[PDB]
């Protein structure tokens, strides 16, 4: 389950498609918890493509459901990313993820 809560401005039409490498100012947030990841710190805004299952499933579907300039707010279910396993030391098992995602991309 991907929940989209968009801070309004953007264009609403440049949708990410297959074979397109897109650029995201992501920011990780734990529900009832602190941050765990941020592209704002490293300031290299994570050039990644679409259709290769590089990222987790909750962030993969939320990437295609945005457009250029938009600033959404993801709510990733545990079963699509880490809720059974848990990323070791960083993500506990059964964790619901929150992301600040802005799509300022290319292609």
From Swiss-Prot:
Activity regulation remarks: Inhibited by both FK506 and rapamycin.
Main subcellular location of this protein, as a coarse class: cytoplasm
The EC number(s) this enzyme carries: 5.2.1.8
One CC-aspect GO term: membrane
Catalytic activity line of the entry: [protein]-peptidylproline (omega=180) = [protein]-peptidylproline (omega=0)
Claim: Acetylation is one of the keywords in the record: no
InterPro entries assigned: FKBP-type_PPIase (IPR050689), PPIase_dom_sf (IPR046357), PPIase_FKBP_dom (IPR001179)
Any GO BP: calcium-mediated signaling
Pfam families according to UniProt: FKBP_C
SUPFAM superfamilies: FKBP-like
Domain PPIase FKBP-type: residue ranges: 19-107
Enzyme class at the top of the EC tree: isomerase
Top-rank taxon, per record: Eukaryota
Function per UniProt: Has the potential to contribute to the immunosuppressive and toxic effects of FK506 and rapamycin. PPIases accelerate the folding of proteins. It catalyzes the cis-trans isomerization of proline imidic peptide bonds in oligopeptides.
Subunit-structure text: Identified in a complex composed of RYR2, FKBP1B, PKA catalytic subunit, PRKAR2A, AKAP6, and the protein phosphatases PP2A and PP1. Interacts directly with RYR2.
Entry protein name: Peptidyl-prolyl cis-trans isomerase FKBP1B
Annotated source species: Homo sapiens
